[PDB]
Structure 1
Amino acid sequence: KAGEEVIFTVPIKKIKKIVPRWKRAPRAVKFVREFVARHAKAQEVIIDPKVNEKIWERGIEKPPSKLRVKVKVEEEKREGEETVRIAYVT
């Protein structure tokens, strides 16, 4: 798939008991980052400060069970990648 856009829901559930609970929130973010990258078949991605806020909202300890995210695919120049994805909350 090429051109825009997928709306995806990423299951956060790995975050509990893969790492501990305060520091679920740094972990959630690595999961959001992986899920999107995986699905995209892409580099690490840039994700909007809005996803952060969403994960973070309750605090470090309590991140939410799902998070709905909108991703796009785009190219670049100079030499390099396909491989760049801009994703934000929906």
Structure 2
Amino acid sequence: DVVTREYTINLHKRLHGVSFKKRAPRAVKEIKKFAKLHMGTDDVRLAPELNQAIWKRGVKGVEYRLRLRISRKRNEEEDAKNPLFSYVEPVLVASAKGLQTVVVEED
């Protein structure tokens, strides 16, 4: 079931008490685990525009709230995982506050 939604994600409560050399690499593994919870897939991808959005304030200055877009798609032939995989990508907005989850229509 191809379904694409929006999400904020509170990276302040997930990076609590982590060493400063491992905050930005941990925030990558937190999003791969966040996509597994909502979509229920194992193959999670991150567009390189999302990688720039985490690492922009150095290793130790990861933002509190990101605003993600997660697309669940069909997988290609002769892949032995499962036919579905997520694709996490960013949507830029002025403030990440005050926004709740919204189902994106397709066309």
The residue number in structure 1 matching 2:9 is: 10
Instruction: Assess if the C-alpha contact under 8 Å between 1:10 and 1:69 holds in 2.
Output: yes
Gapped regions of structure 2 (runs ≥ 5)? 92-107
The residue number in structure 1 matching 2:90 is: 89
Query: SS of the counterpart of 2:41?
Result: coil
* CA deviation after TM superposition for structure 1 residue 44, in Å: 3.8
> How many equivalent residue pairs?
88
* CA deviation after TM superposition for structure 1 residue 71, in Å: 0.9
**TM-score normalized by structure 2?**
0.74
In the alignment, the residues of structure 2 paired with residue 79 and residue 85 of structure 1 have an alpha-carbon distance, to the nearest angstrom, of: 15
**TM-score normalized by structure 1?**
0.86
* CA deviation after TM superposition for structure 1 residue 79, in Å: 5.0
Moved over 6 A (4+): none
* CA deviation after TM superposition for structure 1 residue 51, in Å: 1.3
Q: Percent identity?
A: 24
Change (3 A) 1:79 1:47: closer
Q: CA RMSD in A?
A: 1.5
**1:1-90 aligned within 5 A:** 2-13=1-12, 14-17=14-17, 19-76=18-75, 77-78=77-78, 80=80, 81-90=82-91
Gapped regions of structure 1 (runs ≥ 5)? none
Query: SS of the counterpart of 2:62?
Result: coil
**Is the radius of gyration larger for structure 1 or structure 2?**
2
Instruction: Assess if the C-alpha contact under 8 Å between 1:50 and 1:88 holds in 2.
Output: yes
